[PDB]
Enzyme design. Structure first.
Site, short mmCIF file in Angstrom:
data_model
loop_
_atom_site.label_atom_id
_atom_site.label_comp_id
_atom_site.label_asym_id
_atom_site.label_seq_id
_atom_site.Cartn_x
_atom_site.Cartn_y
_atom_site.Cartn_z
N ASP A 15 0.79 -1.24 0.00
CA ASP A 15 0.00 0.00 0.00
C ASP A 15 0.82 1.29 0.00
O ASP A 15 0.29 2.35 0.21
CB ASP A 15 -1.03 -0.02 1.12
N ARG A 29 0.96 6.86 0.09
CA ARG A 29 0.19 5.82 0.82
C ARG A 29 -1.24 5.78 0.20
O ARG A 29 -1.87 6.82 0.01
CB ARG A 29 0.17 6.20 2.29
N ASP A 34 -5.83 -1.09 3.67
CA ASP A 34 -4.78 -1.54 4.55
C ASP A 34 -4.31 -2.89 4.06
O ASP A 34 -4.98 -3.93 4.22
CB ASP A 34 -5.23 -1.64 6.00
N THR A 35 -3.11 -2.89 3.52
CA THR A 35 -2.48 -4.23 3.19
C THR A 35 -1.73 -4.72 4.43
O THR A 35 -1.24 -3.91 5.23
CB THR A 35 -1.49 -4.11 1.96
N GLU A 37 1.53 -5.89 6.58
CA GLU A 37 2.99 -5.62 6.47
C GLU A 37 3.68 -6.82 5.83
O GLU A 37 3.13 -7.92 5.78
CB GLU A 37 3.61 -5.23 7.84
N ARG A 75 3.88 11.26 3.88
CA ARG A 75 3.40 10.47 2.76
C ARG A 75 2.21 11.13 2.06
O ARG A 75 1.33 11.61 2.69
CB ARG A 75 3.04 9.04 3.19
C1 LIG Z 1 -4.18 5.54 5.10
C2 LIG Z 1 -3.84 6.63 6.07
C3 LIG Z 1 -2.92 6.41 7.13
N1 LIG Z 1 -2.63 7.41 8.00
C4 LIG Z 1 -1.72 7.20 9.15
C5 LIG Z 1 -2.64 6.73 10.27
C6 LIG Z 1 -1.89 5.58 10.90
O1 LIG Z 1 -1.22 6.20 12.04
P1 LIG Z 1 -0.24 5.38 13.00
O2 LIG Z 1 1.05 5.32 12.20
O3 LIG Z 1 -0.12 6.40 14.10
O4 LIG Z 1 -0.67 3.99 13.36
C7 LIG Z 1 -0.84 5.11 9.88
C8 LIG Z 1 -1.08 3.78 9.14
O5 LIG Z 1 -0.25 3.68 8.00
P2 LIG Z 1 0.27 2.23 7.67
O6 LIG Z 1 -1.01 1.43 7.62
O7 LIG Z 1 1.03 2.48 6.37
O8 LIG Z 1 1.19 2.07 8.80
O9 LIG Z 1 -0.88 6.02 8.88
C9 LIG Z 1 -3.30 8.67 7.83
O10 LIG Z 1 -3.05 9.60 8.63
N2 LIG Z 1 -4.16 8.94 6.80
C10 LIG Z 1 -4.50 7.96 5.97
O11 LIG Z 1 -5.30 8.25 5.07
CA LIG Z 2 -0.12 -1.53 5.89
#
Ligand SMILES: Cc1cn([C@H]2C[C@H](OP(=O)(O)O)[C@@H](COP(=O)(O)O)O2)c(=O)[nH]c1=O
Ligand SMILES: [Ca+2]
Length: 129
Positions: A15, A29, A34-35, A37, A75
């Site tokens: 993702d 991103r 959500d893929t 890890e 991102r």
């Molecule tokens: C998809 C997405 C993730 N995020 C942030 C929230 C999550 O916070 P936390 O890092 O605090 O858990 C994290 C998840 O990304 P990943 O799923 O790539 O880790 O990315 C956003 O802020 N906006 C979004 O649209």
């Molecule tokens: Ca992920």
């Protein structure tokens, strides 16, 4: 919304992709998904799916939603298209991602993806077995 050009720099995982956007490298991103890890079950199958989709595409495009364009980690947040086909939807449709991180003002394609997840789940695909 509308599609803007970008070129693949590098597929990262299921993702996230590094793209060149308006001439600058940026990690993107994928909105609304959500893929797993890479170290999780179907993590590797997710990374491979997105790496093949983006690397094979003649044309990558990004589409921002109506709200926040960059996350707290710098991102870019977008719908990512490969030869006209939305990666975010395709991952969900194959059960390689769950619909997730639905925030208001950045949820234009929620129900299209939910419709894809329901089919994936009906077909008991990958994540859904
Ligand atoms: C998809 C997405 C993730 N995020 C942030 C929230 C999550 O916070 P936390 O890092 O605090 O858990 C994290 C998840 O990304 P990943 O799923 O790539 O880790 O990315 C956003 O802020 N906006 C979004 O649209
Ligand atoms: Ca992920």
């Amino acid at each position: 919304l509308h599609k803007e050009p970008a070129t693949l720099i590098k597929a990262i995982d299921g993702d996230t992709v590094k793209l060149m956007y308006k001439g600058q490298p940026m990690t993107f991103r994928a909105l609304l998904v959500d893929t797993p890890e890479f170290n999780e079950k179907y993590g590797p199958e997710a990374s491979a799916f997105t790496k093949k989709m983006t690397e094979n595409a003649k044309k990558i495009e990004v589409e921002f939603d109506k709200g926040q364009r960059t996350d707290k980690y710098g991102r870019g947040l977008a719908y990512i298209y490969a030869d006209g086909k939305m990666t975010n939807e395709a991952l969900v449709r194959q059960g390689l991602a769950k619909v997730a991180y639905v925030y208001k003002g950045n949820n234009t394609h929620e129900q299209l993806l939910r419709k894809a997840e329901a089919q994936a789940k009906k077909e008991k695909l990958n994540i859904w077995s």
